[PDB]
Amino acid sequence: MPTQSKHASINIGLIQAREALMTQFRPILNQANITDQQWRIIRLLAENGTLDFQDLANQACILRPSLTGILTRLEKAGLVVRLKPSNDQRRVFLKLTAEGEKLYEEIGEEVDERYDAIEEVLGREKMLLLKDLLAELAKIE
Amino acid sequence: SINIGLIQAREALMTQFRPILNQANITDQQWRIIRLLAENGTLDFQDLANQACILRPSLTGILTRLEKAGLVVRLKPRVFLKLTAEGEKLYEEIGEEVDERYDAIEEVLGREKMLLLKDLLAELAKIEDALN
Ligand SMILES: O=C(O)Cc1ccc(O)cc1
Structure with missing residues (x-):
């Protein structure tokens, strides 16, 4: 094994996180005949x-x-x-x-259910923080 | 939308690291x-x-x-x-340049925010398993 990089890959973290959302959202999107x-x-x-x-x-x-x-x-x-x-x-x-x-609306409500489930578990404060940090990273440049 | 936010944050990282990976002739x-x-x-x-x-x-x-x-x-x-x-x-040689660009990014957002984001992503991943 080589020496690990100083920084963990935020990229891979972002990719795995969205992919975990998509497996929950894939059947919803498929049924409404909508792609990602x-x-x-x-x-x-x-x-x-x-x-x-x-x-x-x-x-x-x-x-x-x-x-x-x-x-x-x-x-x-x-x-x-x-x-x-x-x-x-x-x-x-x-x-x-x-x-x-x-x-x-009809897809949005189905999708939002998992967002709500995570929010009831993670807490509204943390949820907001995550959304704000993603937006701050995204608005870089 | 955490989904949309996640992909936007990723596209922004990509632009920061693209020149490093291309100079090495490597794809994402x-x-x-x-x-x-x-x-x-x-x-x-x-x-x-x-x-x-x-x-x-x-x-x-x-x-x-x-x-x-x-x-x-x-x-x-x-x-x-x-x-x-x-x-x-x-x-190791690409990784070093990559760590350098991360240091620059961390100086823009701040180390604490970068650590917070990493911590929340990690918490998000552990919620996802628990719910399932
Ligand atoms: O996380 C990394 O390893 C750096 C990186 C980020 C985004 C990308 O598209 C390629 C490499």
């Missing part, structure tokens, strides 16, 4: 109201051409609508439709 | 595997798959290339995996 990437988008559009294409890619962490393809499909499905701003000719905003909002 | 997945092997000493294929969060056929491909590069050895003739001498060496 699709739900990141759906939950972000619901919670932010709207995001422009560029901000949506950064926050959902999806490569840009792949996001376009996903968006195209979500629009054809009637879940996502494009919003154009009167002060920028190229910039595109995205928002859930009525159908998209309803889908968010 | 390859580095992930090298670290897990280095830090566990020896692992079976399945355990490696689970800890790296990589599906088995995709892992086989990555392992195939790490072996051809002389960094990883399969134990032959359930399959076990181990780093070579060179793989260990690579872990």
